[PDB]
RNA sequence: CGAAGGCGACUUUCUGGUCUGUAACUGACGCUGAUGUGCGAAAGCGUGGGGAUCAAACAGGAUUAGAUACCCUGGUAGUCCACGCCGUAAACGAUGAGUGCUAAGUGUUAGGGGGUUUCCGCCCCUUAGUGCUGCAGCUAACGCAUUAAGCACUCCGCCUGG
């Protein structure tokens, strides 16, 4: 699915103040699993927990 | 009227130039890049700030800067001993505030951080 | 960002050197600045995730 | 003559009288062809002033000097390619310049004749505590490479 | 993934379509080929920007025993996006697109059946592919091949001297 803000309970470890994502062989992931830690948690991660830059 | 100024660095891999300014923008004067017999951008060397912007510092005496803060947004060979003229006279390197911005990005481009 | 206090300055080459690198989204940091071309990567731009 | 290269020298022998080469080297400057029959005398009328002048022989006081000839310690670099790159460096008796024998401070010969019987005595006894004088032992071989800083 | 040129920031879209596990079902209802389908990258291409970057020209420098050239900032446009594209690239697969195999193997993206469930992983079946090799075949050889440069049923176009 695509985990929304506070759906990052279990995935605040890949979630970060100052932007760290681990891809796909940092988790063991296949290609969904990767795939939501690579677009769902973003909903949480970007807007309002990542400056991309200025 | 001590314990009052910044080192606010403009180095880049070249260009060792150094602003002996306020904690905010206020720019009293330097040994900068500009400063020493050097331009910039082939000063890939401190003496910028390797002795002689301490000579600036405690010629003013008004810092007092125990906290000399380098302010620098790029690398720089002259940096890390551009700090050596806060060395020199000795005003306390006590921080490296190398970063480059990350305000947010206002449109379809203007420009801003990489 | 960064304070680091208690080092001498002719041994600032050791202490200019150790906050810089640490992203996994070093790339979505960067985003709306300097974007260039993968051409000699493109040995490795098959290459995980992306969109495929 | 690349592809092949340089590898190290030959070097000298001492004598039964001191047990030193520091005197023999010397002699090997002048070692006519076997026949130094007076060569003898001249390097007997050059090496003896340092000796003579400063009261202490071979070892002591002119260890002041044969301290720092032909070397321990020298000036060199590596294969770094046309710039300036140096840097001190500790070094082997393969080639040579602050221990032994080799460049500046004691040209003994080099006074107002055209003779070799007695100008060897006259221009001699300049390193006595490792002060110049004339080209033939050290003094210059200490002193560099260390000069640029800002717009280096 | 697209008709291609090609397709790249991501939250999202249609998830269109691939896609494999189910495929719930009337009775040839398709490939290529009159139709017709669209564009095809740039050099260049019909408006503000554009000389801001880069940038030809010019400057200006000079190797060692040789420039204005490798050298380029000011800078000529151009570069570039909000209104028009050509039918050209090593768009090369030098290899046209339907029915199916050629001992087959191969680890694997997807989607599944699962055992074991693990601690989301070990083992078996799996295919669009993914690659790897590799049987037959292939041509002179280059070298191709369960996914052609083979094998038996479809069309297309090419040319049998250039």
Redesign the interface.
């Known amino acids: 699915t695509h985990i929304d803000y506070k759906d990052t309970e279990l995935l605040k470890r890949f979630i970060?103040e100052?932007?760290?994502?681990?891809?796909?062989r940092?988790t063991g992931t296949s290609?969904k699993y990767?795939?939501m830690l690579?677009t769902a948690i973003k909903r949480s991660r970007?807007m309002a927990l990542?400056p991309?830059?200025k | 009227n001590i314990e009052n100024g910044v080192a606010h660095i403009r180095s880049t891999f070249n260009n060792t130039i150094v602003t002996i300014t306020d904690e905010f923008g206020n720019a009293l004067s330097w040994s900068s890049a500009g400063a020493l017999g050097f331009k910039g951008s082939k000063k890939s060397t401190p003496f910028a700030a390797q002795m002689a912007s301490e000579t600036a510092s405690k010629s003013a005496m008004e810092h007092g800067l125990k906290t000399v803060?380098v302010t620098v947004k790029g690398p720089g060979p002259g940096?890390?001993?551009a700090?050596?003229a806060?060395?020199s006279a000795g005003l306390?390197?006590?921080?490296?505030?190398?970063?480059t911005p990350?305000p947010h990005?206002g449109c379809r481009?203007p420009?801003?951080?990489? | 960002?960064?304070?680091?206090?208690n080092?001498?300055?002719?041994d600032?080459?050791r202490?200019?050197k150790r906050?810089?690198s640490?992203?996994?989204?070093?790339q979505?940091?960067?985003?709306?600045?300097?974007y260039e071309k993968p051409s000699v990567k493109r040995k490795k731009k098959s290459e995980?995730?992306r969109k495929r | 003559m690349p592809r092949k290269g340089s590898v190290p020298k030959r070097d000298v022998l001492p004598d039964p009288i001191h047990n030193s080469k520091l005197v023999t080297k010397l002699i090997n400057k002048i070692m006519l062809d076997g026949k130094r029959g007076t060569a003898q005398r001249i390097l007997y009328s050059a090496f003896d002033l340092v000796e003579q002048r400063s009261g202490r022989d071979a070892l002591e006081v002119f260890e002041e000097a044969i301290n720092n000839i032909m070397p321990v310690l020298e000036v060199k670099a590596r294969r770094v390619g046309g710039s300036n790159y140096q840097v001190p460096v500790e070094v082997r008796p393969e080639r040579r310049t602050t221990l032994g024998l080799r460049w500046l401070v004691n040209y003994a010969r080099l006074r107002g004749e055209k003779t070799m019987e007695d100008r060897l005595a006259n221009e001699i006894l300049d390193a006595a505590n490792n002060t110049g004088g004339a080209v033939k032992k050290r003094e210059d071989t200490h002193k560099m490479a260390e000069a640029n800083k800002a717009f280096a």
């Open positions: 970060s100052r932007g760290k994502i681990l891809p796909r940092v290609a990767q795939r690579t970007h990542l991309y830059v | 803060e940096r890390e001993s700090i050596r806060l060395q306390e390197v006590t921080a490296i505030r190398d970063v990350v990005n481009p420009k801003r951080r990489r | 960002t960064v304070v680091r206090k080092e001498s300055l002719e600032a080459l202490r200019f906050s810089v640490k992203s996994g989204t070093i979505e940091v960067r985003k709306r600045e300097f995980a995730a």
